[PDB]
Amino acid sequence: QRCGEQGSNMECPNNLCCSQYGYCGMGGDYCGKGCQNGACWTSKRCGSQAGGATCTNNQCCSQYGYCGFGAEYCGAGCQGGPCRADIKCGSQAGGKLCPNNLCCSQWGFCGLGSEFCGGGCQSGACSTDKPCGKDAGGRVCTNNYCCSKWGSCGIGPGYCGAGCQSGGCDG
Amino acid sequence: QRCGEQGSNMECPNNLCCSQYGYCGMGGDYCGKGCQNGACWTSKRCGSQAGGATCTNNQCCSQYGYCGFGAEYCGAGCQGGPCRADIKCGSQAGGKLCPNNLCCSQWGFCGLGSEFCGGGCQSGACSTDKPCGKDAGGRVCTNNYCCSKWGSCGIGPGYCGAGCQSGGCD
Numbered sequence: 001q002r003c004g005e006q007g008s009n010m011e012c013p014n015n016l017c018c019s020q021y022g023y024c025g026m027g028g029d030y031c032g033k034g035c036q037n038g039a040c041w042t043s044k045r046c047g048s049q050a051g052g053a054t055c056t057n058n059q060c061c062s063q064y065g066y067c068g069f070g071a072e073y074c075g076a077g078c079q080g081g082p083c084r085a086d087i088k089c090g091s092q093a094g095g096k097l098c099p100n101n102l103c104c105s106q107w108g109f110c111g112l113g114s115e116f117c118g119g120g121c122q123s124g125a126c127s128t129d130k131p132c133g134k135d136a137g138g139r140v141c142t143n144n145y146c147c148s149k150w151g152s153c154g155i156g157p158g159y160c161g162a163g164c165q166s167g168g169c170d171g
Numbered sequence: 172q173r174c175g176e177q178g179s180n181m182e183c184p185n186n187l188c189c190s191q192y193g194y195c196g197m198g199g200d201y202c203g204k205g206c207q208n209g210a211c212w213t214s215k216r217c218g219s220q221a222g223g224a225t226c227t228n229n230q231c232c233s234q235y236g237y238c239g240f241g242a243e244y245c246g247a248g249c250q251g252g253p254c255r256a257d258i259k260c261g262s263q264a265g266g267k268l269c270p271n272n273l274c275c276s277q278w279g280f281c282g283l284g285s286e287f288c289g290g291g292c293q294s295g296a297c298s299t300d301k302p303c304g305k306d307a308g309g310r311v312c313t314n315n316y317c318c319s320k321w322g323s324c325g326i327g328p329g330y331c332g333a334g335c336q337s338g339g340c341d
């Protein structure tokens with residue numbers, strides 16, 4: 001039921017607002033004063049206007065640095081999220097990563113889906129399970145993902161916790 | 172405090188995958204077998220291929236009824252989510268609601284942000300907070316939102332619980 005700061009930065013389904021207390025719902029007590037994520041009445045700031053912060057809920061960051069959905073947000077000047085313009089990444093784009101864990105396809109475009117995350121995926125949430133660590137020549141994962149004790153890349157206590165080899169380890 | 176079925180359908184941030192046990196992460200233990208939401212390695216079904224089920228995580232539903240992002244999903248034939256094509260709604264579209272609580276703006280397009288949700292919003296997550304119920308000539312809320320005892324539309328114990336006047340009351 002908990003969302004936001006009280007719930008590991010989780011997000012409510014269906015664009016429901018996460019209230020100042022960290023519960024999901026709709027209306028003033030959720031989307032008004034203190035809303036943390038979802039369809040907040042005061043849109044969050046993002047991009048160049050907000051020190052490079054990204055939007056939550058896979059929203060688009062507009063040219064003016066507000067998060068939302070629709071042409072004004074995702075169309076021209078969109079700075080982040082699922083922008084209408086194709087988003088370049090990977091070896092085709094100076095090794096740039098995809099935001100929000102999206103997969104960088106073999107062709108250097110950001111998305112999710114087997115075309116992006118399957119054979120040839122360069123970074124992000126690739127489904128292809130490349131070994132890391134001491135039994136894989138010291139290879140580190142992409143995206144600063146944690147290399148687990150068993151030499152697999154991921155995020156979560158099994159990866160970043162005790163026995164983590166590289167990446168965003170706990171300690 | 173959990174995602175997915177163990178946490179009232181909560182979603183993880185940043186497309187992290189919700190494991191079978193309701194924990195958010197990345198890698199095979201999360202995105203592999205049992206993945207409930209996020210960037211699951213086996214993409215979910217959606218659209219006309221799956222009973223009109225929508226995608227979770229504001230993903231685009233492709234022409235083929237799979238959830239994801241990028242041109243193949245949001246471009247030609249996109250059935251839902253942040254399609255690249257403008258999405259019609261409201262009185263200009265025969266009363267059609269926007270999916271996933273998106274606001275139907277005055278001009279009859281789906282979106283989120285003050286143009287869509289502010290003055291003139293027809294339905295979905297409008298900020299205009301029009302009064303409902305007894306003190307509002309019996310007006311009921313859009314989207315089956317609950318009308319609270321105080322005369323304001325929403326979803327939550329204070330709206331749908333004791334004193335709920337109309338909509339999807341408990």
Ligand SMILES: CCCNC(=O)O[C@H]1O[C@H](CO)[C@@H](O)[C@H](O)[C@H]1NC(C)=O
Nearest residue numbers: 043062063064065066072073284285286
């Ligand atoms: C499309 C032009 C009219 N829209 C506008 O100025 O809204 C901008 O400024 C508004 C604040 O003055 C803010 O609420 C709104 O989110 C902002 N919108 C975007 C797309 O960034």
Ligand SMILES: CCCNC(=O)O[C@H]1O[C@H](CO)[C@@H](O)[C@H](O)[C@H]1NC(C)=O
Nearest residue numbers: 070071072257276277278279280286287
């Ligand atoms: C304000 C009148 C001029 N602007 C306009 O109609 O934009 C509306 O129509 C545009 C489609 O013509 C569409 O791309 C855009 O997202 C729509 N914006 C809203 C907030 O519904």
Ligand SMILES: CCCNC(=O)O[C@H]1O[C@H](CO)[C@@H](O)[C@H](O)[C@H]1NC(C)=O
Nearest residue numbers: 086105106107108109115116241242243
């Ligand atoms: C025969 C299929 C070729 N398809 C292709 O190269 O599309 C790539 O390039 C497109 C830009 O030309 C872009 O719109 C599209 O998302 C991209 N797709 C991926 C997975 O990166």
Ligand SMILES: CCCNC(=O)O[C@H]1O[C@H](CO)[C@@H](O)[C@H](O)[C@H]1NC(C)=O
Nearest residue numbers: 113114115214233234235236237243244
């Ligand atoms: C026939 C055109 C080529 N592309 C394709 O069918 O992949 C589609 O079918 C795949 C399953 O065969 C599935 O992995 C993938 O998510 C699907 N992609 C989209 C855009 O929905």
